[PDB]
Amino acid sequence: VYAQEKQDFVQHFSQIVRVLTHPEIGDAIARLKEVLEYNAIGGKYNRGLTVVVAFRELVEPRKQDADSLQRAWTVGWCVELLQAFFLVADDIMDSSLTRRGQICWYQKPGVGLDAINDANLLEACIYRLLKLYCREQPYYLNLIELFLQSSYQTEIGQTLDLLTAPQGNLVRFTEKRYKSIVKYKTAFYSFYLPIAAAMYMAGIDGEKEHANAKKILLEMGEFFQIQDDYLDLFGDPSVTGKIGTDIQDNKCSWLVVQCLQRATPEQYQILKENYGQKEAEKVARVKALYEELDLPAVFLQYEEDSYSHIMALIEQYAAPLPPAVFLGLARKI
Amino acid sequence: VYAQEKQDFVQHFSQIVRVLTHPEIGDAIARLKEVLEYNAIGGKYNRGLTVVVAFRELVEPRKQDADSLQRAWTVGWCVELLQAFFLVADDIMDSSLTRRGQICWYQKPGVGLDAINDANLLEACIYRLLKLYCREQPYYLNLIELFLQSSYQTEIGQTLDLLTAPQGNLVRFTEKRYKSIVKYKTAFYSFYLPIAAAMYMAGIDGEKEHANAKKILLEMGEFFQIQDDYLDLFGDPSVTGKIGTDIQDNKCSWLVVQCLQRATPEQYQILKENYGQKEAEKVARVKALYEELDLPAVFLQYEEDSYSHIMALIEQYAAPLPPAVFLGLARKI
Ligand SMILES: CCCCCCCC[n+]1ccn(CC(O)(P(=O)([O-])O)P(=O)(O)O)c1
Ligand SMILES: CCCCCCCC[n+]1ccn(CC(O)(P(=O)([O-])O)P(=O)(O)O)c1
Ligand SMILES: [Mg+2]
Ligand SMILES: [Mg+2]
Ligand SMILES: [Mg+2]
Ligand SMILES: [Mg+2]
C-alpha cells in the first residue's frame, strides 16, 4: 500500500523542485535546488507517504479530484522537508559521518557550518508550499499551526536529548527521562504530524479524534525511537545508511537505560569507565557488555510486547477512523 | 520617542519569559529561559521598539486599550526573538567571538554546536507568542505569514552572503551583487518587518500601502547594512559590542566593493594577496589599504547622500502614513 504509492510520490518531487525554483537571487535559488536534491531524497519516505496513504483512506474517492491529490502529496513532501531539516541539523549536533548511505551534508568538502542556513532553508520551503497549494483551503491555518507546534515540540525534545548527554561528563539515564525524550524528539513529528495533517485535509478536526489518534501514534513513535537506538549499535550500516555515535556522544539511548537496569555493581563501573568517549576500544567494551546482558534479545522481547500494546491501542482508539490507517503504518515499522 | 518607550519595553520582557516558561519538560524549559536571557537582552531594541512606536502612531488612542498594547509589545518582542535567532546562528557561521559586549552564545564553555537547537527554539517562541496573544485577532494569519516570508527572504540573503564568501578562495565582489545581498539578508526583516507588523495591527493592509512603505524601508535597510560593514572594521568594539571578521571571512563587504572600484592595478594585488585570510598581519594590510584610499571619508560622504535620498523617498511615499513613523526610525540610525 505504501509500496505501490512510493513511485508516484517520488516522481512528484521534480515538481516540488520546479515550483520552488527575481533574477538577482539566481545563485541562492540554485543552491536551494542542490540542498533539496541532496537532503530530501534517499530515505524511506515513510512519513510523507503516510500523509498520502491516510488521505486516500479518509476522503471519499468522489472528493479525491486531481487538485485534491496534488495537495495531499505536497503536504506529504512538506513533512519530508521537515524531516530533511531536522536531519541536516541533528547530524552536526551529533557529529555524525553518514546519512542515508552518503556523507552528511555538513561533512561535504566546501559546506561545513553553512549547512546551518541550508537546514533552515529546507524548513522555509514547507511554508512556501503550504501557501502555494493550500492558501485557499479551510484547513490552511490548521496545517500551518500543526507544522509549527510540531517543530517546537521536537526542538524541545532535542534540548532534552542534548542536556542529558553533556560531552565529557549515568545517574541521569532513567526510564522516566528516556520516555520523555523520545516523546518530544520523535513521536510528535514522525507519527502524529503526518496522520493529523491528513485528518485536517479530510475535514476531520475534532479535539477528541485528534487526542485518540495521538494516544495510538505517540506510542508507535516511542517504539520507533527505541528501534532507532537499537539499530544505532546493532544495525548494518549498509542497510541503515548511517554510522552510530550514541555511546561516543554520551546519549540516553534505550540500550544504556536497560543495561543500567541490569548491571552488577562491577559492570556499572565498566560502563562508567568507557561510556561517552570517542575511543573505539572503549566503545567496543560497552558493546561487549550489552551483548553480555543479552540486550539484543531483550530488544527482540520488547519489540513483541510493544507491538501487542500498539495493536490493543488501535482496537481501543481507532474508531471512527479506518483501522487500516494505523495498521498500514505499524506494518511498515 | 524610542528613548522614552525603551523602559516599558524592556520591563515587559519578564512577562514574555513567564508566559513562555508538563513537569517532564522542566529542564528543557529552564534551558529556554537561559537561552532567552542571554540572547534576547543586551541590544538596542530598535526593531522591536519600532513595532510599538509605529503602533502608537497609527492607531487612535481610543483604540489603544491595555490589551491592544500588550499585543503591540508582544509582537515587538517576537521581532526581537527573530533577531536573536538570526544572531545566534550568524555568529557560528561567521566564527565570531563577541556579540553585544559578551562572548557569543556558541563560544560559551559547555554550549558549542548545541547553540543550533537553542537558535531555532528562539524562532519557535515567536509563533507560540503569536498564538498566545493574537490568535483571535483578524491580523493573526497576516502576521504569521509576514514573519515566515521574512525568514525565508533573510535565509535567502544568507545563502548569497555565504556563496559569495567561500573560505579559502574578488571578481565576485560587484555593486550589483552587494545590493542584492543586503536587500535579502537585512532589509526585509530589520526594516520592513517591524513597520508592516504594526500596519497589519492597525488594520492597514492594502497592497499599495505596503509596497510604498517597502520602497522607503528597503533603502533604509541597505544603508543600515553598509553602516554595519563600516563599523565591522572602523568601529570601536567597546561601543559595537562585537569584533569584526569580514576580511578574515572573505566577505562581500561594502568596504571591499568600494576599494575594488578605486584600486590601482598594484593595489588590486595587495588585496588579492591578503584578503580572506585569518592572519592578523594580512588583515592590517587590507585595513591600511582602505585608509590609503580614504574609504572612511567615502563612507561619511555616502552616509550623507543616502540620508538625503531616504528623506526624498519619505516625501514621495509616506502618504497616507504619518511621516514621523519613518523619520523616527531614520533618526535612530
Ligand atoms: C533544529 C532542531 C531540530 C533537531 C532535530 C531533532 C530530531 C529528532 N531526531 C530523531 C532522530 N534523529 C536522528 C538521530 O541522530 P538518528 O537518525 O539515529 O541519527 P538521533 O538518534 O539524534 O535522535 C533526530
Ligand atoms: C538561520 C539563518 C539565518 C541567518 C541570519 C542572517 C541575518 C543577516 N544578518 C545581518 C546582520 N547579521 C549579523 C552580522 O554577522 P553582523 O551583526 O555584522 O555580525 P553579518 O555582517 O554576518 O550580516 C546577520
Ligand atoms: Mg540527536
Ligand atoms: Mg539514533
Ligand atoms: Mg553573516
Ligand atoms: Mg557585519
Nearest ligand (C-alpha, residue A121): 2
Contact B120 A124 (CB under 8 A): no
CB-based contact A276:A168 (threshold 8 Å): yes
Residue A185 cell numbers, joined: 524528539
3-state secondary structure of A121: helix
Containing H/E element for B103?
A: strand B102-103
Neighbours of A158 (CB within 10 A): 24
The closest alpha carbon to B224, from B265, B258, B262, B183, belongs to B183
Neighbouring C-alpha atoms within 13 Å toward the C-beta of A177: 21
Alpha-helical regions (H) of A235-322: 237-240, 254-262, 265-274, 280-292, 295-317
The residues of A annotated as belonging to the active site are 44, 85, 90, 94, 99, 161, 185, 224, 228-229
Q: How many other C-beta atoms can be found within 10 angstroms of the C-beta atom of residue B206? A: 10
Give the C-alpha separation, B23 to B25, whole Å.
Answer: 6
The CATH number of the domain covering residues in A1-333:
1.10.600.10
What CA–CA distance (Å, rounded) separates A115 from A106?
Answer: 5
Say how many Å lie between the CA of residue B278 and the centre of ligand 2. 19
Alpha carbon B278 to its chain centroid, in Å, reads: 26
Nearest-CA neighbor of B174 among B86, B257, B72, B293?
A: B257
Residue B153 contacts by C-beta under 8 Å, 6 or more apart in sequence?
Answer: B184, B188, B189
3-state helix, strand, coil in chain B (%, to 5): 75, 0, 25
- Secondary structure (DSSP) of B265-291: HHHHHHHHHHTT---HHHHHHHHHHHH
Q: What is the sign, positive or negative, of the torsion defined by CA atoms of A259, A263, A266, A267?
A: negative
Name every chain B residue with its beta carbon within 8 A of the beta carbon of A93: 113-114, 116-117
Q: What contacts B156, CB < 8 A, 6 or more positions away?
A: A25, A28, A29, A121, B184
Burial class (CB in 10 A: 0-12, 13-18, 19+), A330: middle
Ligand 2 atom index nearest CA of B242: 19
CA distance B126 to B81: 7
Do A214 and A146 form a contact (C-beta atoms < 8 A)?
A: no
Residues touching ligand 2 (Cβ under 6 Å) are A 117, 120; B 86, 89-90, 94, 154-155, 158, 185-186, 228, 232, 242
A122: nearest CA partner in chain B: B152
Sequence ranges of the domains in chain A: 1-333
C-alpha cell at B274: 591578503
Separation of alpha carbons A321 and A213, rounded Å:
9
d(CA A173, CA A110): 37
* Cβ–Cβ gap B155/A113 under 8 Å: no
Q: What SS3 class is residue A102? A: strand
How near does any CA of chain A get to the CA of B62, in Å?
Answer: 31
Q: Resolution, in Å, please? A: 2.3
Chain centroid to Cα A198, Å, comes to 17
| CB within 8 Å of B124: residues ≥ 6 apart | A148, A151, A152, A155
With a CB cutoff of 8 Å and minimum separation 6, the contacts of B88 are B39, B104, B105, B106, B115, B118, B119, B122
A73: its cell numbers: 502529496
Q: How many whole angstroms from A93 Cα to the centroid of ligand 1?
A: 9
Distance CA A255, CA A233 (A): 9
* H or E element at residue A13: helix A13-20
Ligand 1 lined by A158 (C-beta under 6 Å):
yes
What angle is formed at CA B64 by the lines to CA B58 and CA B70, rounded to 5 degrees?
Answer: 105
Residues B122 and B135 sit within 8 Å (Cβ to Cβ)? no
| A179/A237 Cα distance (integer angstroms) | 26
Cα A23 to chain centroid distance, Å, stands at 36
Neighbour count for residue A96 (Cβ, 10 Å): 20
Burial status of residue A103 (CB atoms within 10 A of its CB: 0-12, 13-18, 19 or more): middle
DSSP symbols for A217-238: HHHHHHHHHHHHHHHHHHS-HH
Q: Rounded CA gap, B95 and B92, in Å?
A: 5
Give the burial class of B24: count Cβ atoms within 10 A of its Cβ; 0-12 exposed, 13-18 middle, 19 or more buried.
Answer: middle
- Calculate ∠ Cα A48-A51-A53, nearest 5°: 105
Q: What is A35-60 written as a DSSP string?
A: HHHHHTSSS--HHHHHHHHHHHHHS-
Provide CB contacts within 8 A for B84, sequence distance 6+.
B36, B39, B40, B119, B122
Q: Reduce the DSSP state of residue A155 to 3 states and report it.
A: helix
Query: Rounded to an integer, what distance in angstroms lies between the CA atom of residue A327 and that of residue A50?
Result: 11
CA distance A18 to A307: 41
CA-closest residue to ligand 1 atom 24? A90
